């Protein structure tokens, strides 16, 4: 039938960036006319594929990754980027083929007093490889003393909360991000425009 892009975009709740959700799109026709011709998107950037030509292509599978970050971190969802989100939360490959979509969600994901449901990984020993999902809550060892699972000096919880408030600046307001990855394998294609 029709690929369920509405389930991903118009979802009541989104996931934290460290626990980003992934939807597998296959065996359906994907009409992107609603997406790239919608004025409710702050960012719509495609890499290696033109958005207009998308309806004239066919791919083996499509992956729709969805999460929430702040506005200043939207640029980190791009190939070759660095930063806390790009290094420890969500990393795109250098040969990324697909589109990145992001829109402001201050009306949905923010409340007076702070929304603390959305988290991001702040500490990690090594950077994330592309499309890696790290939900570990092990205490980060910033020193030479083993932490043994108890917080303390040089032993910090890897996750932090955004604490979205509607009074925050646009750079600290919540943005919902959807990453469409079009994978190309030597297999029959099940997604077309």
């Amino acid at each position, epitope marked *: 039938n029709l690929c369920p892009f509405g389930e991903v975009f118009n979802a009541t709740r989104f996931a934290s960036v460290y626990a980003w959700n992934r939807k597998r799109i296959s065996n359906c026709v994907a009409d992107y006319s609603v997406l790239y011709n919608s004025a409710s998107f702050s960012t719509f950037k495609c890499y290696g594929v033109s958005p207009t030509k998308l309806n004239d292509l066919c791919f083996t599978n499509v992956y729709a990754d969805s999460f929430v970050i702040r506005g200043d971190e939207v640029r980190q969802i791009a190939p070759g980027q660095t930063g806390k989100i790009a290094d420890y939360n969500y990393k795109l490959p250098d040969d990324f083929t697909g589109c990145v979509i992001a829109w402001n969600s201050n009306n949905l994901d923010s409340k007076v007093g702070g929304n*603390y449901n959305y*988290l991001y990984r702040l500490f990690r020993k090594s950077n994330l490889k592309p499309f890696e999902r790290d939900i570990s809550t092990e205490i980060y060892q910033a020193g030479s003393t083993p932490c043994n699972g108890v917080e303390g000096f040089n032993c910090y919880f890897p996750l932090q909360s955004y*604490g979205f408030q509607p009074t925050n600046g646009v750079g600290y307001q919540p943005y919902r991000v959807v990453v469409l990855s079009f994978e190309l394998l030597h297999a029959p294609a099940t997604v077309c425009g």
Partner: antibody
Amino acid sequence: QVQLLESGGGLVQPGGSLRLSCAASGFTFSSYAMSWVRQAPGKGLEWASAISGSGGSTYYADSVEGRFTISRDNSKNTLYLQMNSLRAEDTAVYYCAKDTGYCGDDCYIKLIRGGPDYWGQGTLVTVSS
Amino acid sequence: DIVMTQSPLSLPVTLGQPASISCRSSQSLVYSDGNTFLNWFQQRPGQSPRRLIYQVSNRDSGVPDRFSGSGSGTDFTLKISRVEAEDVGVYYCMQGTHWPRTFGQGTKLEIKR
């Protein structure tokens, strides 16, 4: 209107145990973090414990860590504070407080920051022989 | 732990004149998102504390306009425009940015008539 009614206070000998209940109403209980704050006679406030909305994450003050355990029943809309191995310094008026912040299923306590929306009437516990 | 000092510990004031309460933090209260989580509480005898001001300058619902808050970083001040009879009680500043949540010593606002 949001209401927080507290119960379980009374007299207890040192080393004893008792559980306090905080019946909350007027809001989505599972959506907000709840806390227990104590105030000794003639002393200022002192945070004692707190839970996330879902109940998975708990925090305790250094004075109370290991001694007290804090729990929550979202179905009953009730907050619980189990006090064990009580000592004389624990004698205080205990309040349950709802935070203005938005916590719950995928949130963590100790990662939140803000202030208490509303406070209960407060219940007094005395520890003496 | 962030320790906060209130000044004065006792604040006598006459009816109708302004009153000022100072709260100083041992550590900067600003956070990454440029938000400062300082709160002001009023506690009447035998009653639960009620939050007058949240985030330095924002007043809670039901708080009269006589109360105002100011400050930044480590130094903050609570201002009462004209003290009324109901304003008697103990006022606390609380630190919400970092656990553990700490409180000031509390100032006793008593009125003279």
